[PDB]
JSON list of C-alpha atoms and ligand atoms in Angstrom, two decimals:
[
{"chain": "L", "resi": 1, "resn": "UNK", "atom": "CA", "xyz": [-76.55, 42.26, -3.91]},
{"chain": "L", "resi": 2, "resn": "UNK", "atom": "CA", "xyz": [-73.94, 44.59, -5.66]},
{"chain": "L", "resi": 3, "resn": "UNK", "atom": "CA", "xyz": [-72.29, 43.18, -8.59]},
{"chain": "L", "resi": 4, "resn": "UNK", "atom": "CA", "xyz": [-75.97, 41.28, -9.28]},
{"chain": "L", "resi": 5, "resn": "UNK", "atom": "CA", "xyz": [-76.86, 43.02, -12.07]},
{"chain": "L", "resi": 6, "resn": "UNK", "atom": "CA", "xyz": [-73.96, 42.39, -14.17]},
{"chain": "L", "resi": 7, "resn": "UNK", "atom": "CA", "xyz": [-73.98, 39.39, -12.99]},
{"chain": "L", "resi": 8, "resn": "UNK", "atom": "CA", "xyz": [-77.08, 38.28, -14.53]},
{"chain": "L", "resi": 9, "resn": "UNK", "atom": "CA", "xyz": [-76.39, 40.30, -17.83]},
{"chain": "L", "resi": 10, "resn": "UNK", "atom": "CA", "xyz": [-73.19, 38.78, -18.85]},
{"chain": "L", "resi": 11, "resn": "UNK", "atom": "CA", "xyz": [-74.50, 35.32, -17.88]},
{"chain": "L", "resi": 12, "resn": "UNK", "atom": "CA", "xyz": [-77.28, 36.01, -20.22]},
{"chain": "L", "resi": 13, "resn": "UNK", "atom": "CA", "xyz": [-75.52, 37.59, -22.97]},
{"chain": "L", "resi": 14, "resn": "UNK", "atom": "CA", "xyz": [-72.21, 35.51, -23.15]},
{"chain": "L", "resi": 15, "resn": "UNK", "atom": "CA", "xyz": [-69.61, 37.79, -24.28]},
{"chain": "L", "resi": 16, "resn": "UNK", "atom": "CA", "xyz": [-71.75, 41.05, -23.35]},
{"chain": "L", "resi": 17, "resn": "UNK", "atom": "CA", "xyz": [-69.11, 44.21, -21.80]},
{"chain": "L", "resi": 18, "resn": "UNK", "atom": "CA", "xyz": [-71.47, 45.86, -19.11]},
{"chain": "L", "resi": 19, "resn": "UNK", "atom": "CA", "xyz": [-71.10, 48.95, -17.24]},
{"chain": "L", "resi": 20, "resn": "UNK", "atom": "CA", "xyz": [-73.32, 49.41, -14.12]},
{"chain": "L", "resi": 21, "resn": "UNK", "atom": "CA", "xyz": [-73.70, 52.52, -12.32]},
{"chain": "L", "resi": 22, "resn": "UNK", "atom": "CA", "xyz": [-75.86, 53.07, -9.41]},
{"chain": "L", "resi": 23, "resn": "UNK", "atom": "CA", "xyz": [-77.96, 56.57, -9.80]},
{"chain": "L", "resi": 24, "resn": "UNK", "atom": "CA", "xyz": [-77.72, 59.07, -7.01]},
{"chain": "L", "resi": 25, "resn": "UNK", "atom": "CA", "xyz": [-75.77, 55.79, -5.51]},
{"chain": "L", "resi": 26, "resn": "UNK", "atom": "CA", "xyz": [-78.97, 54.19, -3.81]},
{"chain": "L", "resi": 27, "resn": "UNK", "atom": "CA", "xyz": [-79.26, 50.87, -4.55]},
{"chain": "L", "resi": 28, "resn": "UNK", "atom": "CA", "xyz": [-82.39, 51.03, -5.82]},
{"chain": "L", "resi": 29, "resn": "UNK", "atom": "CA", "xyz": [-82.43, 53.22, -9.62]},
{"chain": "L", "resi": 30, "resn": "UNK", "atom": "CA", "xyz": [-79.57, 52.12, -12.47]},
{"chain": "L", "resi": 31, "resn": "UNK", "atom": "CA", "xyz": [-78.08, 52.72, -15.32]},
{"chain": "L", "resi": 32, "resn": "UNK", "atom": "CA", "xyz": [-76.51, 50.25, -17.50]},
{"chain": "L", "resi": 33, "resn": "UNK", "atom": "CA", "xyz": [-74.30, 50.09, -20.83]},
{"chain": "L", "resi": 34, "resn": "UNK", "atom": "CA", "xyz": [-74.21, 47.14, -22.36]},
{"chain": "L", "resi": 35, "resn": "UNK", "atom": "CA", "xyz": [-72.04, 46.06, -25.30]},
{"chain": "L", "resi": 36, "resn": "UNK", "atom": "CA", "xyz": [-72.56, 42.46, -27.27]},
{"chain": "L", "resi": 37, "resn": "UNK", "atom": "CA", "xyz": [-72.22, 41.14, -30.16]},
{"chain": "L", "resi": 38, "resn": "UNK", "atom": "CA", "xyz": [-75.29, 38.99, -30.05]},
{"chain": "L", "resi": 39, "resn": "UNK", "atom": "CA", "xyz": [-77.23, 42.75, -30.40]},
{"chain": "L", "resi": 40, "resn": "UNK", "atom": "CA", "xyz": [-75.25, 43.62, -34.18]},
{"chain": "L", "resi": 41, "resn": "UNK", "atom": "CA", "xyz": [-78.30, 44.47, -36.86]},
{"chain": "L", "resi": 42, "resn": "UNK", "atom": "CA", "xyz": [-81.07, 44.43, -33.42]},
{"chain": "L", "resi": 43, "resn": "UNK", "atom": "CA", "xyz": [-83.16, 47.59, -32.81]},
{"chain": "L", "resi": 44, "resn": "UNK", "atom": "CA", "xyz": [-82.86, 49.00, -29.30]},
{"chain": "L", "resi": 45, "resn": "UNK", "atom": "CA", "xyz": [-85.98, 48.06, -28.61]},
{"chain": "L", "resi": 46, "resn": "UNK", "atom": "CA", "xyz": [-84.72, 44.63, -29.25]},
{"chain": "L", "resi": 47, "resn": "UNK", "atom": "CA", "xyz": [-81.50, 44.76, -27.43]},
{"chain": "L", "resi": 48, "resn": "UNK", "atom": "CA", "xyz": [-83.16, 46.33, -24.26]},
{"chain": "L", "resi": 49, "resn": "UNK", "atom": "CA", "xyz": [-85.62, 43.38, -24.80]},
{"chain": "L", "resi": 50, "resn": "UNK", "atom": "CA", "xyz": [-82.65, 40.87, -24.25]},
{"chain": "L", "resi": 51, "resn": "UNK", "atom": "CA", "xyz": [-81.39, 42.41, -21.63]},
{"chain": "L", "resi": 52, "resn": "UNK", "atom": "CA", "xyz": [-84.61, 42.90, -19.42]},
{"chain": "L", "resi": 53, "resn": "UNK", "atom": "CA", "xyz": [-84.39, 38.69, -20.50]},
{"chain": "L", "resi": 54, "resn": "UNK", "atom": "CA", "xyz": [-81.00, 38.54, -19.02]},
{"chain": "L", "resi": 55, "resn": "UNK", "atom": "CA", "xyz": [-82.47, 39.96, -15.44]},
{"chain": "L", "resi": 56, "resn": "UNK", "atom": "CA", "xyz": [-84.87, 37.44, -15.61]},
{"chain": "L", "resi": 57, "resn": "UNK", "atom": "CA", "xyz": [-87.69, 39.30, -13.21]},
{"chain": "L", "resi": 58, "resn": "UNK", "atom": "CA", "xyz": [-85.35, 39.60, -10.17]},
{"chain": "L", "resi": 59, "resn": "UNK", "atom": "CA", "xyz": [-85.12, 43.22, -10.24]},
{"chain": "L", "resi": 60, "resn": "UNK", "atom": "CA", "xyz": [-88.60, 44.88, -9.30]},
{"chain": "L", "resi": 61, "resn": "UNK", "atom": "CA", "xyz": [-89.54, 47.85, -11.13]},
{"chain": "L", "resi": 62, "resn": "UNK", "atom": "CA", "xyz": [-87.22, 47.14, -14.28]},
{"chain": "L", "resi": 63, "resn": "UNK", "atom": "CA", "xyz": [-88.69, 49.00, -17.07]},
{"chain": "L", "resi": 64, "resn": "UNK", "atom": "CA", "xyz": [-87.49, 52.09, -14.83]},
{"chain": "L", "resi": 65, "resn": "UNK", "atom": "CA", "xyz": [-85.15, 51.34, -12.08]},
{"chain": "L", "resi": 66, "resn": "UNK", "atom": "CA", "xyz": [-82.20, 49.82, -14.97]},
{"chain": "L", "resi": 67, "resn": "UNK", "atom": "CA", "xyz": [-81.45, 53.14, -17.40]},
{"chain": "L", "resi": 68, "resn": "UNK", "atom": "CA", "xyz": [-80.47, 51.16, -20.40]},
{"chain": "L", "resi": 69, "resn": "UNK", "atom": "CA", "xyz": [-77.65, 51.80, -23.38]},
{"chain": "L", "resi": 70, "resn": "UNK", "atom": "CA", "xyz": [-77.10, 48.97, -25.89]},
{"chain": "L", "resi": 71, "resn": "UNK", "atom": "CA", "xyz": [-74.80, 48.76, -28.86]},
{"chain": "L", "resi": 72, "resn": "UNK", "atom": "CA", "xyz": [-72.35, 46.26, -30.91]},
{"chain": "L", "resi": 73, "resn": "UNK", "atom": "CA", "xyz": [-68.66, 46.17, -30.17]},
{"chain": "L", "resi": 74, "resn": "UNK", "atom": "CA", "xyz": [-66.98, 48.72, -32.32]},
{"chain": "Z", "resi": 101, "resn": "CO", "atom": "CO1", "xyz": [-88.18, 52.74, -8.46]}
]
């Protein structure tokens, strides 16, 4: 459902800032920004790793359908 995706993150990551937006707007391909403490001194690969966690297999196609941008609060 909308609102899904972040749902899942920030219940996840606790304390995670997300931004979704829906590329080309068709419910199917993503892109996400997500911004947590928990990923301070983590490589991308690592934070993305967390975050693909987070969705916990619901979304089909993950590795390409959710765009992903990860950082620590600044
Ligand atoms: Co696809």
């Amino acid at each position: 459902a909308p609102g899904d995706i972040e749902d899942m993150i920030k219940a996840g990551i606790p304390g995670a800032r997300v931004t979704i937006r829906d590329l080309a707007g068709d419910g199917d391909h993503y892109a996400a920004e997500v911004v947590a403490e928990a990923f301070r001194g983590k490589t991308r690969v690592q934070q993305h790793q967390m975050v693909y966690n987070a969705l916990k297999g619901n979304m089909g196609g993950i590795l390409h359908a959710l765009a992903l941008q990860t950082s620590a609060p600044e």
